[PDB]
Structure 1
């Protein structure tokens, strides 16, 4: 009930990791 807030939280974390992979690709296309 709460348990559901946590689920949301997990889901959030997961988009942030996907954002990190995007930036890893962008960084290389530039030349970091």
Structure 2
């Protein structure tokens, strides 16, 4: 359950990261 909690935690950061990069790509295209 530690390994499963770390797993989710990792995913949720990755969603945050992919959103920051989408925001960068959007800016740069404007």
> Would you call these one fold, judging by a TM-score over 0.5?
yes
Structure 1 vs Structure 2 CA RMSD: 1.5
What 5-or-longer segments of structure 2 have no aligned partner? Answer: none
Paired residues, what number? Answer: 30
Give 4+ residue runs of structure 1 displaced > 3 Å after superposition: none
Q: Which has the larger radius of gyration?
A: 1
What 5-or-longer segments of structure 1 have no aligned partner? Answer: none
TM-score normalised by L of structure 1: 0.80
TM-score normalised by L of structure 2: 0.84
